[PDB]
Amino acid sequence: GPQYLREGLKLVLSPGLRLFVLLPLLINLVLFVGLIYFAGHQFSLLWPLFVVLVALMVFFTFTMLANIIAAPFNGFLSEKVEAVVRGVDNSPPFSWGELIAMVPRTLAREMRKLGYFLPRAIALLILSFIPVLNLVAAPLWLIFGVWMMAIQYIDYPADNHKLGWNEMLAWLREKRWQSLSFGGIVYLVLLIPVVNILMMPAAVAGATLFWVRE
Amino acid sequence: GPQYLREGLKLVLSPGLRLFVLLPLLINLVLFVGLIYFAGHQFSLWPLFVVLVALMVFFTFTMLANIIAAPFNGFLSEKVEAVVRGVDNSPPFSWGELIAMVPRTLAREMRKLGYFLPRAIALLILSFIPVLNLVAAPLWLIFGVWMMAIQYIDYPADNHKLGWNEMLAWLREKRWQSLSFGGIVYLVLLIPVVNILMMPAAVAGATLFWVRE
């Protein structure tokens, strides 16, 4: 179960994939470093509450944009990590221009993902401030959190092969244990603020692997 | 433990105290009704940003609510002492008396919030650290009960001149019964409707706390 993710690390490190692996890993890192540069300088440019608050704003918008921009790039590698473990062994000849074709579909999928996320995200936040109910908000956030990991990454290979919007989810439901496992371990590793930059493509690798073996 | 609070409910209903009981009970009631009127009309004028102004007006409303209803509590607090003590039932205290407490209660309240806000903000930051959140609400429950103890038990202990720290120390000296009183009081605070009546019952119970210990 975390083995999918580990093998995803093995494949993400494959010499043939390294182009397609390092491609979104560089735009993601400059954005990660691009954060603290913009956060250090501009964020400085009652009150404590408001500051923690707007900080959270910044974090939310930052995350959301990071995902919507890295969305197509992940969908691309998804096909390629599939290729490697499948027919076209290791390095598969895919050109740059290819990326142009995935732009509409991947972005549609991503925005659909955020439209699934936000309302349940808002519901859990509101449960988080009902003085005696809060005791179960965080464990709900956590479970909803890792299921949100599952669909986020298991969506890439299952969109490359045409699938309905709900259908994917239903399949995600049709085997909840392994989904929750994969999303789970990918979440645990997601926590680490440094190694995660490499583990995010490791994620989509493991997820394409996940559909391949199922 | 909650019997001191219940006894407060008995005292808060005593025919002699009904003046001093119905003094803050009306200004708090009109502020409770005054909340939803202003929130019904003005809030529309104002989703994440929406939830933002929402929580903002909620907790800021409670803040101004405390700094406004602060003097009236201290006033009643002196009476429930008197009532259960020497001057039985109705104790003859006139309106102008209040004027003497306004400077002290406000200088005590902003100290409570000075105590509260940074610990409040300390827990909020704890509530967004991914795997650590699992214990943020339990802390918030404990911290929320201890925030009821020092809220009300501070009234009679401020009538009898005590330091801001010293009170806390005494509250620390007997943690269990403090957490008890503040505990039940918090549990009754949750009720959105009955709390308006149990808010004055609480301070009565707290003076009772200072008295019986």
Cβ–Cβ below 8 Å for A56 and B128: yes
- Closest among B150, B143, B111 to B124, alpha carbons compared: B143
Residue B92, both tokens: 């003859």
Instruction: Give dist(CA B58, CA A126) in Å, integer.
Output: 13
Provide the residue ranges of all domains of chain B, joining segments of one domain with +: 1-213
Taking each helix axis from N to C end, the angle separating A137-160 and B136-152, rounded to the nearest 10 degrees, works out to 150
Q: Are B74 and B101 in contact (CB under 8 A)?
A: yes
Method of structure determination: X-ray
DSSP A148-192: HHHHHHHHHHHHHS---HHHHHHHHHHTHHHHHHHHHHHHHHHHS
- What was the resolution (in A) of this experimentally determined structure? 3.5
- A54 Cβ partners below 8 Å, 6+ apart? A43
- Closest among B137, B139, B166, B133 to B150, alpha carbons compared: B166
Contacts of B130 in chain A (CB under 8 A): 191
DSSP A135-146: GGHHHHHHHHHH
- B120 Cβ partners below 8 Å, 6+ apart? none
- Closest among B147, B154, B156 to B207, alpha carbons compared: B156
Residue of A60, A132, A138 with shortest CB distance to B133: A138
A38 to chain B, closest Cα gap in Å? 21
Whether A67 and chain B come into contact, CB under 8 Å, resolves to no
B109 to chain A, closest Cα gap in Å? 15
Cβ–Cβ below 8 Å for B137 and A142: no
Under DSSP, the state recorded for B131 is: G
- When computed from its CA atoms, the radius of gyration of chain A, rounded to whole angstroms, is 18
Instruction: Give dist(CA A63, CA A200) in Å, integer.
Output: 13
Residue of A49, A53, A138 with shortest CB distance to B137: A138
Long-range contacts, stretch B46-51, CB < 8 angstroms, 24+ apart: B47/A118, B47/A122, B48/A57, B48/A60, B51/A122, B51/A125, B51/A126
Name the residue of chain A whose CA is nearest to B57's CA. Answer: A46
- B26 Cβ partners below 8 Å, 6+ apart? none
Instruction: Give dist(CA B109, CA B105) in Å, integer.
Output: 6
Rounded to whole angstroms, what are the CA distances from B33 to A89, B26, B29, B77, B180?
Answer: 71, 10, 6, 25, 30
Residue of B121, B137, B190 with shortest CB distance to A137: B137
Name the residue of chain A whose CA is nearest to B130's CA. Answer: A191
Contacts of A196 in chain B (CB under 8 A): none
